Amino acid sequence: SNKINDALNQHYKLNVELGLVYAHYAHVADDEFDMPYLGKFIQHLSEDKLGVHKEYISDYFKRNGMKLKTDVSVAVKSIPSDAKALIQEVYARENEVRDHVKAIAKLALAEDDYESFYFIQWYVRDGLKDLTEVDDVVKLFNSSNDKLIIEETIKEMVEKEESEHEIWG
Amino acid sequence: SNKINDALNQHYKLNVELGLVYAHYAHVADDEFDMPYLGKFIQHLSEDKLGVHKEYISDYFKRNGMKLKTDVSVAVKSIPSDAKALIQEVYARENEVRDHVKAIAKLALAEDDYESFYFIQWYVRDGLKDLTEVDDVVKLFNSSNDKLIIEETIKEMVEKEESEHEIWG
Amino acid sequence: SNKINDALNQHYKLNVELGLVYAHYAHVADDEFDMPYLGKFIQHLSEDKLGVHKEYISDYFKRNGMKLKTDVSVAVKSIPSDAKALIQEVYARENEVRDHVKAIAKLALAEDDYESFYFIQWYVRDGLKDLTEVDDVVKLFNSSNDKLIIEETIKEMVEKEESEHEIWG
Amino acid sequence: SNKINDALNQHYKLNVELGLVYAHYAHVADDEFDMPYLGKFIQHLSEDKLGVHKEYISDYFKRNGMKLKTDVSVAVKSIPSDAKALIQEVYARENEVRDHVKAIAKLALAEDDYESFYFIQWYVRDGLKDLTEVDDVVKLFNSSNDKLIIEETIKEMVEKEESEHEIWG
Amino acid sequence: SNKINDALNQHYKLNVELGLVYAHYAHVADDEFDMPYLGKFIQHLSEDKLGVHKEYISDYFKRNGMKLKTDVSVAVKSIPSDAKALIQEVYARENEVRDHVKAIAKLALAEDDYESFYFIQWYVRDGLKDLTEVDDVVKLFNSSNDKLIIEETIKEMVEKEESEHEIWG
Amino acid sequence: SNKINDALNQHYKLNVELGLVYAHYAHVADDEFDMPYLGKFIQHLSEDKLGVHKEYISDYFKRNGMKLKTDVSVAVKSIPSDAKALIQEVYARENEVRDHVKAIAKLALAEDDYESFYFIQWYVRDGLKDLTEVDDVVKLFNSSNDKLIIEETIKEMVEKEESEHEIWG
Ligand SMILES: [Cl-]
Ligand SMILES: [Cl-]
Ligand SMILES: [Cl-]
Ligand SMILES: [Cl-]
Ligand SMILES: [Cl-]
Ligand SMILES: [Cl-]
Ligand SMILES: [Cl-]
Ligand SMILES: [Cl-]
Ligand SMILES: [Cl-]
Ligand SMILES: [Cl-]
Ligand SMILES: [Cl-]
Ligand SMILES: [Cl-]
Ligand SMILES: [Cl-]
Ligand SMILES: [Cl-]
Ligand SMILES: [Cl-]
Ligand SMILES: [Cl-]
Ligand SMILES: [Cl-]
Ligand SMILES: [Cl-]
Ligand SMILES: [Cl-]
Ligand SMILES: [Cl-]
Ligand SMILES: [Cl-]
Ligand SMILES: [Cl-]
Ligand SMILES: [Cl-]
Ligand SMILES: [Cl-]
Ligand SMILES: [Cl-]
Ligand SMILES: [Cl-]
Ligand SMILES: [Cl-]
Ligand SMILES: [Cl-]
Ligand SMILES: [Cl-]
Ligand SMILES: [Cl-]
Ligand SMILES: [Fe+3]
Ligand SMILES: [Fe+3]
Ligand SMILES: [Fe+3]
Ligand SMILES: [Fe+3]
Ligand SMILES: [Fe+3]
Ligand SMILES: [Fe+3]
Ligand SMILES: [Fe+3]
Ligand SMILES: [Fe+3]
Ligand SMILES: [Fe+3]
Ligand SMILES: [Fe+3]
Ligand SMILES: [Fe+3]
Ligand SMILES: [Fe+3]
Ligand SMILES: [Fe+3]
Ligand SMILES: [Fe+3]
Ligand SMILES: [Fe+3]
Ligand SMILES: [Fe+3]
Ligand SMILES: [Fe+3]
Ligand SMILES: [Fe+3]
Ligand SMILES: [Fe+3]
Ligand SMILES: [Fe+3]
Ligand SMILES: [Fe+3]
Ligand SMILES: [Fe+3]
Ligand SMILES: [Fe+3]
Ligand SMILES: [Fe+3]
Ligand SMILES: [Fe+3]
Ligand SMILES: [Fe+3]
Ligand SMILES: [Fe+3]
Ligand SMILES: [Fe+3]
Ligand SMILES: [Fe+3]
Ligand SMILES: [Fe+3]
Ligand SMILES: [Fe+3]
Ligand SMILES: [Fe+3]
Ligand SMILES: [Fe+3]
Ligand SMILES: [Fe+3]
Ligand SMILES: [Fe+3]
Ligand SMILES: [Fe+3]
Ligand SMILES: [Mg+2]
Ligand SMILES: [Mg+2]
Ligand SMILES: [Mg+2]
Ligand SMILES: [Mg+2]
Ligand SMILES: [Mg+2]
Ligand SMILES: [Mg+2]
């Protein structure tokens, strides 16, 4: 499917640009908001988008004959005003990821592309996983007014040896 | 120095875009040229550019008050015709990296920015290191006409537990 | 160079007197401000100034024929009003350290004293390292109003098995 | 007792200035007299004066409400002519330490300050310990005319895993 | 830079010829002056000059396109009269090494050859290291008139598991 | 024997100059012929000539009263045209080594210098050993036209834990 090749190239592009924006947001979290642990959490998110998220698509393309396209433009011209808004912006991006992944799964079924529907199940699962982790961080800013209390809870999230849920892990 | 902040933001941008181009080149090396080990070598190069190469600058900026800028545009519209030309293109990019790094070191001395001159020594050293590794791969294509013989030599380069030279490591 | 011998004797004197002031500030942090961990952080800073910071210069002088001078006068006649101001005063001293080190590196190049320029690279690097650690402590007082929350974060900074950055470590 | 607070602040000052003079003497022992082991012995003495000797007083002050004062002036304007005289000068300083400590113990009893008399017992003991170690080094210069023979004996003193006397250790 | 290529080929030649002279001096130290440990110390110096000192330049040349030249002439026609003069001659050669290295660092900056300035920092550091070790041996001959006492001290220097100084190591 | 002293000083000179030429040839093998493993094989040969080959003679001279002479002149003005010719030139030098060693053994018997005949047996044995290793490398260039196939076989020769023949080892 050229439709599937296109939607998956779009998703590759979305994960690259997300990764670069999060790298910037990670820098701002520490450097401007004095929240280094919030920065590491977002930095880890950035390396996931620029890592397996994009690399699994290129690996898939090499298996099935689809064409990879690298066409990337992103610029960070405005920054959220504080840390809560920063992680709220992260949340909004991840929510849009779940929607685009939903379109790809729907399209693979429309095309009877059962290899692509299999492949996208990983991204269906991770769409909810990543959103859960970010939402666990959003809740902190409404559970405490002390930025060092929040930082301590993020520290444990980031340093947790993360044992993986039977379904969503 | 705003000059130094600018040159270093330029270098951050160069390492991001290099990283993305190499990720594409890595895919093409395996998928089009049937050279998976050439792909892993270039993939490792890609993750270095998108990893410590960019992250050390953002770390530096957070230490010294310089501003980070994320403004990235790159698109891979043409691909080299064969594997030799691919790694020759990689070589040319790395050679231009050494020139830009040279300008930054010269500028830091002009500015009496001895912290920036210290910081850039890492990139002066890695400029020659990375170029050496790529040149060791370029030489292979003129030492053999058998693409599987070359692949075997790249395999050992990539899988080498790389012990680091006292000066250039 | 007598210029270099003089600037380095000045720096030796600055590190001695800094060390003694920080020893006093460490005492005041616990004894007056009830922040024992802030005290240990500043005490560790004090022992670095009176330790390798001064001892590396005397070691250098013994290698190259320069004369060591011990001429030290310092008295702590006024104390900052609270803990935030205390660590802000520490910060200001460290910022002045970076400036004096910059003058020495500039002077060594002016003199073509490449041994002294090599020697001072350590102090160029540590100038930014020490300032980073102190600034990580300054930020705490504006991230929380609870002095025991701050103390807990300083406790982890001090007790961290500090793995050292590839460039600034 | 303000008398005790004063005498102990005086002793703090004496240990700081002693420490700095010994650091200079350690440098001169190696650099001028070619006796690096004599230097390490004196350097170790210097770090004891600037270490537990001063830090125990500041720790005591924080426990009992006494005020710490940092008022330090010392300059090394003349150097002994040879190594024997150097360690003889060290000896004379340590002998004066024992006298000042004796005055403090006598004063604490006069004041019925039994906490201060307890505290000073450490310094009564170390006064004789330190003097013994220095005197063991003074004797060497009258037991041999060969500076390398002396250096070898000091080397073992410094490198001895020093097991501590039941009373004076 | 052809200037840099030339100065570095000159330095390669200097290290080769130094190495061969020290090999002769090592032989004379044992065979004529009955100082086998002085011989091993000088022999170790010889193998450093003919080892990493020359090999790092050839390694550098292979990285950057500079030409290696092997043009070597040296003959040992006169021998110092005794051991003190022998190690004094060694000292004089090492002092001239520091001067030639200084010229190369100055030249690399003049040329904006920041790779060559990086490369030469190793030789700036080792220039002072090697001179320190030799000077520690020169001092022995003026600290004792007994050639076996001196030999014992050199023995420990040579057999020392040499832990390396943070700056000069 | 002055004859033996002379022939052995000649051999010392031959091993020094051979060592320096091989160091150059090792550089050229990698840098010009893209054969780094050929370079390491020749580099190892170079360090043997400048190592035990010369050092055993100086050790012998110190035992028996013979005079050591260091008189060395060598310059590499022409380089072989390709790798095969390079290792063929190495072979020719080693073959001449066997002839000079033969003259020394013959001379020691003529002189009834049975200590020198004993000493030279090592060099009689190593003369054939070294020639065998080099000849095993010469044969490769006539067994394959692929320079990377040859390099792989040299790699194993160099990395072989070389267990030593009962006679020639
Ligand atoms: Cl834009
Ligand atoms: Cl934006
Ligand atoms: Cl904030
Ligand atoms: Cl659809
Ligand atoms: Cl899955
Ligand atoms: Cl475009
Ligand atoms: Cl393109
Ligand atoms: Cl191809
Ligand atoms: Cl410039
Ligand atoms: Cl580095
Ligand atoms: Cl005053
Ligand atoms: Cl003050
Ligand atoms: Cl406070
Ligand atoms: Cl200046
Ligand atoms: Cl450093
Ligand atoms: Cl004065
Ligand atoms: Cl004085
Ligand atoms: Cl003396
Ligand atoms: Cl009294
Ligand atoms: Cl006690
Ligand atoms: Cl001559
Ligand atoms: Cl001569
Ligand atoms: Cl002698
Ligand atoms: Cl110049
Ligand atoms: Cl170094
Ligand atoms: Cl010639
Ligand atoms: Cl020739
Ligand atoms: Cl060839
Ligand atoms: Cl004969
Ligand atoms: Cl044998
Ligand atoms: Fe397609
Ligand atoms: Fe970051
Ligand atoms: Fe994760
Ligand atoms: Fe394809
Ligand atoms: Fe808000
Ligand atoms: Fe994920
Ligand atoms: Fe700026
Ligand atoms: Fe890939
Ligand atoms: Fe790498
Ligand atoms: Fe900033
Ligand atoms: Fe081609
Ligand atoms: Fe790199
Ligand atoms: Fe001076
Ligand atoms: Fe304290
Ligand atoms: Fe520290
Ligand atoms: Fe001096
Ligand atoms: Fe305040
Ligand atoms: Fe420090
Ligand atoms: Fe009081
Ligand atoms: Fe010292
Ligand atoms: Fe002690
Ligand atoms: Fe108090
Ligand atoms: Fe005297
Ligand atoms: Fe003591
Ligand atoms: Fe050249
Ligand atoms: Fe020898
Ligand atoms: Fe050494
Ligand atoms: Fe070349
Ligand atoms: Fe003499
Ligand atoms: Fe060295
Ligand atoms: Fe003879
Ligand atoms: Fe080499
Ligand atoms: Fe061998
Ligand atoms: Fe002799
Ligand atoms: Fe040929
Ligand atoms: Fe051999
Ligand atoms: Mg259907
Ligand atoms: Mg200038
Ligand atoms: Mg100048
Ligand atoms: Mg009474
Ligand atoms: Mg200039
Ligand atoms: Mg006969």
d(CA A158, CA A34): 17
Chain E neighbours (≥3 Cβ pairs under 8 A) are B, C, D, F
Ligand 14 ion local residues (Cβ < 5 A):
C 106-107, 110
The conformation of residue B70, written as its DSSP 8-state character, comes to -
Whole-angstrom distance, CA of residue F68 vs CA of residue F58: 7
DSSP assignment of chain A, as one string?
A: -HHHHHHHHHHHHHHHHHHHHHHHHHHHHHHTTS-HHHHHHHHHHHHHIIIIIHHHHHHHHHHHTPPP--EEEEE-----SSHHHHHHHHHHHHHHHHHHHHHHHHHHHHTT-HHHHHHHHHHHHHHHHHHHHHHHHHHHHTT-S-HHHHHHHHHHHHHS--PPPTTT-
CA C87 – CA B134 distance, rounded (Å):
48
Nearest CA among A36, A43, A59, A28 for reference residue A122: A59
Q: CA triplet C146, C151, C152: central angle to 5 degrees?
A: 100
- Classify C162 as helix, strand or coil: coil
Q: Is F25 helix (H, G, I), strand (E, B) or coil?
A: helix
Angle between helices F114-141 and F83-110 (to 10 degrees): 160
Cα D94 to chain centroid, rounded? 6
Contact C102 B112 (CB under 8 A): yes
Can you give the C-alpha Rg of chain B in angstroms? 17
User: Which chain B residues are closer than 8 Å to F148 by Cβ?
Assistant: 140, 143-144, 146, 149-150, 152-153
How far apart are alpha carbons D140 and C112 in whole angstroms? 44
Q: Is A151 on the interface with C (CB under 8 A)?
A: yes
Cα separation values, A42 from D45, D82, F160, Å: 50, 64, 49
Q: Single out the residue of B51, B13, B45 nearest to residue B29, CA to CA.
A: B45
Question: Which residues does chain F have within 8 Å of residue B139's beta carbon, measured at their own beta carbons?
Answer: 34
Q: Name the 3-class secondary structure at E166.
A: coil
Query: Hey, what are A164's tokens?
Result: 């993986």
Cα(D66) to ligand 70 centroid in Å equals 22
Instruction: Round to whole Å and give the CA distance between B78 and E100.
Output: 50
| Of D123, D153, D128, the residue nearest D141 (C-alpha) | D153
F30, amino acid identity: D
Q: Do the Cβ atoms of B48 and B164 come closer than 8 Å?
A: no
CA separation for the pair B137, B42 (Å, rounded) = 10
E59 contacts B132? CB cut-off 8 A: no
CA–CA distance, B153 with B33 (Å, rounded to integer): 16
Tell me whether residues A74 and B70 touch, CB distance under 8 A.
yes
Pairing verdict, β F71-75 and D71-75 = unpaired
DSSP secondary structure of D115-151? HHHHHHHHHHHHHHHHHHHHHHHHHHHTT-S-HHHHH
Helix (H) or strand (E) run with residue E36 in it? helix E36-48
CB half-sphere exposure, F26, CA atoms < 13 A: 20
For residue C73 the two structure tokens come to: 């006068």
Ordered DSSP codes for E148-160:
HHHHHHHHHHHHS
Question: Residue E114 Cα, ligand 69 centroid: separation in angstroms?
Answer: 15
16-75 in chain E: CB under 8 A from chain C:
none
**Residue E114 in contact with partner chain B when CB distance is under 8 A:** yes
Give the count of beta carbons closer than 10 Å to the beta carbon of residue F150.
24
- Cβ within 8 Å, pair E166-C122: yes
Please state, in angstroms and as integers, the Cα–Cα distance from residue D83 to each residue in C140, D153, E143, following that order: 51, 15, 12
CA of D52 to the centre of ligand 21 (A): 64
Separation of alpha carbons E6 and D89, rounded Å: 55
Contact E68/F20, CB-based, under 8 Å?
no
CB-CB under 8 Å, C21 with D70: yes
Cα distances from C27 to residues C33, D8, D53, D65, in angstroms, run 9, 15, 15, 12
Instruction: Give the closest of E56, E64, E112 to B128, CB-based.
Output: E64
Q: Which helix (H) or strand (E) holds E73?
A: strand E71-75
DSSP conformation class of D163: P
- Label residue D10 exposed, middle or buried (CB < 10 Å: 0-12, 13-18, 19+): middle
Question: What distance in Å separates the CA atoms of residue D44 and residue D38, rounded to the nearest whole number?
Answer: 10
User: How many Å separate Cα E157 from the centre of its chain?
Assistant: 16
Token pair, residue D109, equals 């009893």
Q: How many CB atoms lie within 10 A of CB A121?
A: 12
SS3 (DSSP) at C71:
strand
Residue B103 and residue B101: Cα distance in Å, rounded? 5
Is residue C88 a contact partner of residue C80, using CB atoms and an 8 Å limit? yes
Contact between chains at B72 and A74 (C-beta distance less than 8 A)? yes
Cβ pairs bridging A and B (under 8 Å): 65
- Helices E114-141 and B114-141: crossing angle in degrees, nearest 10, is 110
DSSP-assigned beta bridge partners for residue E75: F71
Inter-axis angle of helices B2-31 and B36-48, to 10 degrees?
160
Determine contact, residues A130/A98, Cβ cutoff 8 Å: no
Cα E38 to the center of its chain, rounded Å: 15
Q: Is residue D87 within 8 Å of residue D38, measured between CB atoms? A: yes
Cα gap C132→C98, rounded to integer Å: 12
- Confirm if E43 and E137 have CB atoms less than 8 A apart: no
Distance, C-alpha D142 to centroid of its chain: 22
Q: CB distance F146–B150 less than 8 Å?
A: no
Q: Which residue from B minimizes the CA distance to F83?
A: B143
- Taking the C-alpha atoms of residue C36 and residue C152, their distance in angstroms, rounded to an integer, is 10
CB atoms within 10 A of CB B64: 17
Across chain D, the runs of DSSP E, i.e. the strands, are 71-75
Q: Which residues in chain C are closer than 8 Å to D20, comparing Cβ atoms? A: 16, 70, 72
Q: Quick one: closest CA in A to C151, which residue?
A: A148
How was this one solved?
X-ray
Cα–Cα distance for residue pair D89/D40, rounded to 1 Å: 16
Nearest bound ligand to the CA of residue C76 = 12
Residue C102, token pair as written in the block: 């910059």
Q: Residue D71 class from Cβ within 10 Å (0-12 exposed, 13-18 middle, 19+ buried)?
A: middle
Resolution (A): 2.5
Check: CB of residue C52 under 8 Å from CB of residue C130: no
CB of E60 within 8 A of CB of E8? yes
In angstroms, rounded to a whole number, what is the distance separating the alpha carbons of residues F112 and B50?
74
Question: Which tokens sit at A123?
Answer: 């991204």
Q: What is the DSSP letter of E34?
A: S
**CB-based contact, E168 to chain B, within 8 Å:** no
* Residues contacting E54, CB < 8 A, separation 6+: E12, E15, E16, E19, F23
CA distance B134 to B87: 7
Q: Find the Cα–Cα–Cα–Cα dihedral F139, F141, F145, F149, rounded to 10°.
A: 80
Question: What is d(CA F49, CA F100) in angstroms, rounded to the nearest whole number?
Answer: 15
